[PDB]
Amino acid sequence: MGHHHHHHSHMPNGKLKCDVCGMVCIGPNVLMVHKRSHTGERPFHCNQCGASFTQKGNLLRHIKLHSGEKPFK
Ligand SMILES: [Zn+2]
Structure with missing residues (x-):
């Protein structure tokens, strides 16, 4: 009559980060308005x-x- 126990518990936890980072700016048509200013x-x-x-x-x-x-010149 022998004795043997069983209890060695291990479980996973935690998660990953995937936060979005790539915001782009937009500009107006600066080429047309600067030309317009140069036009008399x-x-x-x-x-x-x-x-x-x-x-x-x-x-x-x-x-x-x-x-x-x-x-020509
Ligand atoms: Zn011409």
């Missing part, structure tokens, strides 16, 4: 280019230099 009153657009200027003296010689005349 009339957008000096080259009708033969589709190019936008705000300087008249640039546009006035630019439309001239479009023809095969005038020295």
